[PDB]
Amino acid sequence: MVHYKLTYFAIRGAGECARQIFALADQEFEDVRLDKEQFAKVKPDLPFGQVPVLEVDGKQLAQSLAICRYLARQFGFAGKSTFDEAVVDSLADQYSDYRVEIKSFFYTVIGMREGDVEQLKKEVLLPARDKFFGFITKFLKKSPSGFLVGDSLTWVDLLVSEHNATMLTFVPEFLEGYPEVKEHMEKIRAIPKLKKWIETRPETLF
Amino acid sequence: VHYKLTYFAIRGAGECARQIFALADQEFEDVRLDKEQFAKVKPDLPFGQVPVLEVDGKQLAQSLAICRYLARQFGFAGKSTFDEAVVDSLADQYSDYRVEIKSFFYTVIGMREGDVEQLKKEVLLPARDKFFGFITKFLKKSPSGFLVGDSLTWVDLLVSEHNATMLTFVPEFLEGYPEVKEHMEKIRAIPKLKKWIETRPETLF
Numbered sequence: 001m002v003h004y005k006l007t008y009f010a011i012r013g014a015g016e017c018a019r020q021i022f023a024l025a026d027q028e029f030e031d032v033r034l035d036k037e038q039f040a041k042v043k044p045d046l047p048f049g050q051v052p053v054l055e056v057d058g059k060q061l062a063q064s065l066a067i068c069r070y071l072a073r074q075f076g077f078a079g080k081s082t083f084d085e086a087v088v089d090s091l092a093d094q095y096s097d098y099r100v101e102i103k104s105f106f107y108t109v110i111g112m113r114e115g116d117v118e119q120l121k122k123e124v125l126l127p128a129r130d131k132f133f134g135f136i137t138k139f140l141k142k143s144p145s146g147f148l149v150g151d152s153l154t155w156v157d158l159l160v161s162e163h164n165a166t167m168l169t170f171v172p173e174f175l176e177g178y179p180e181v182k183e184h185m186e187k188i189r190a191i192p193k194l195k196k197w198i199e200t201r202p203e204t205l206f
Numbered sequence: 207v208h209y210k211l212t213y214f215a216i217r218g219a220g221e222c223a224r225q226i227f228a229l230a231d232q233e234f235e236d237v238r239l240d241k242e243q244f245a246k247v248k249p250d251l252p253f254g255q256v257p258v259l260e261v262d263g264k265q266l267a268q269s270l271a272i273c274r275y276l277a278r279q280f281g282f283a284g285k286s287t288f289d290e291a292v293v294d295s296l297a298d299q300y301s302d303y304r305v306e307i308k309s310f311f312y313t314v315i316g317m318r319e320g321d322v323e324q325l326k327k328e329v330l331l332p333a334r335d336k337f338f339g340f341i342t343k344f345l346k347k348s349p350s351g352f353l354v355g356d357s358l359t360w361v362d363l364l365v366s367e368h369n370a371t372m373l374t375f376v377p378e379f380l381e382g383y384p385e386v387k388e389h390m391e392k393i394r395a396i397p398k399l400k401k402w403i404e405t406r407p408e409t410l411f
């Protein structure tokens with residue numbers, strides 16, 4: 001078969017989306033989780049000095065979005081047409097811009113930077129969430145299938161669903177008045193093969 | 207197929223797509239808005255921002271998604287799915303790089319308060335050194351001269367245009383990277399692209 005090796009830290013973060021893709025494609029792969037010191041040794045042989053890095057039959061591929069998209073195309077979770085795929089691509093990119101806005105809150109609460117959690121929540125996180133959910137909700141209200149794009153699962157369903165499940169861990173109010181976003185999160189994570197992975201994967205915060 | 211690129215009267219995020227149409231000899235509507243006309247159309251855009259591309263009325267936002275979509279249509283995305291992915295990662299790396307230098311970039315075009323010189327010497331140049339380190343590595347291991355595979359792909363157009371733009375503000379930008387200089391020249395010498403470079407509206411970025 002094609003052999004796959006996901007290399008990333010001992011956390012979900014940027015590597016998780018790809019791990020969910022393999023779970024849903026029932027695709028077996030090597031799932032390498034590194035500590036700081038192990039990373040420091042392999043780092044210079046990585047295409048951009050960072051992780052996640054995927055290997056397909058030895059050949060290296062960096063950047064989480066590129067990884068997830070590549071794997072989604074192989075297994076049928078990218079979109080059922082080239083334009084639909086592009087629409088999925090834009091949701092993924094929007095989500096990434098959203099991650100930049102909340103970077104300050106997100107790295108404070110995992111505790112790898114110091115700051116005031118509470119005003120970062122109120123002033124940074126929640127306004128960025130309101131804007132972003134405003135867009136997500138619009139795609140959901142105009143999708144009667146229940147997925148963000150088209151009539152089936154695509155990998156942005158997995159990004160947006162996992163992020164929201166993760167954030168409820170730190171901010172229980174997070175999906176406070178957005179029932180359609182709540183619905184989506186539940187719908188996707190109820191897919192038995194995904195739920196299985198959720199139950200069996202190593203438990204990490206974020 | 208009718209195409210409509212909507213963006214501001216600048217190159218910035220919209221230019222990559224404009225270069226794709228130039229190279230595909232694809233005619234399209236090229237809509238450049240001022241602040242006040244944007245403010246009026248903004249709420250009907252998918253994420254409230256530009257660039258937005260329309261294919262036969264169907265709206266598509268996010269510059270990377272636009273460029274990749276158009277590249278696939280016209281044959282500039284990569285000649286396999288993995289090669290396309292490798293092109294995707296270069297594009298994404300470049301975008302991370304844009305985040306690092308955001309503070310310098312908006313100060314020097316003068317649409318932001320700033321401390322030019324330490325931003326240049328402490329922010330811009332170290333981010334460039336790291337980024338060019340990667341770009342150079344792809345170039346040294348590419349016998350064709352393009353960042354990926356043996357032909358033009360849309361990241362060639364992003365990286366080439368950004369470097370030409372930055373030389374405008376920082377003339378020492380490419381100095382200790384002749385291979386990056388080469389790449390910039392190689393791509394922008396492609397006649398169809400050079401013709402667009404000579405005929406497009408001149409803007410200060």
Ligand SMILES: N[C@@H](CCC(=O)N[C@@H](CS)C(=O)NCC(=O)O)C(=O)O
Pocket residue numbers: 014049050051052062063064065298302
């Ligand atoms: N755009 C990159 C960002 C990922 C990233 O920054 N990962 C960090 C871990 S938090 C890394 O690999 N190294 C951190 C470092 O050494 O700077 C991606 O999606 O892979």
Ligand SMILES: N[C@@H](CCC(=O)N[C@@H](CS)C(=O)NCC(=O)O)C(=O)O
Pocket residue numbers: 093097218219254255256257267268269270
């Ligand atoms: N992250 C988006 C860029 C979206 C964006 O910030 N667009 C700018 C122009 S370069 C804009 O429209 N700014 C004004 C606004 O959001 O109202 C992309 O990757 O295309």
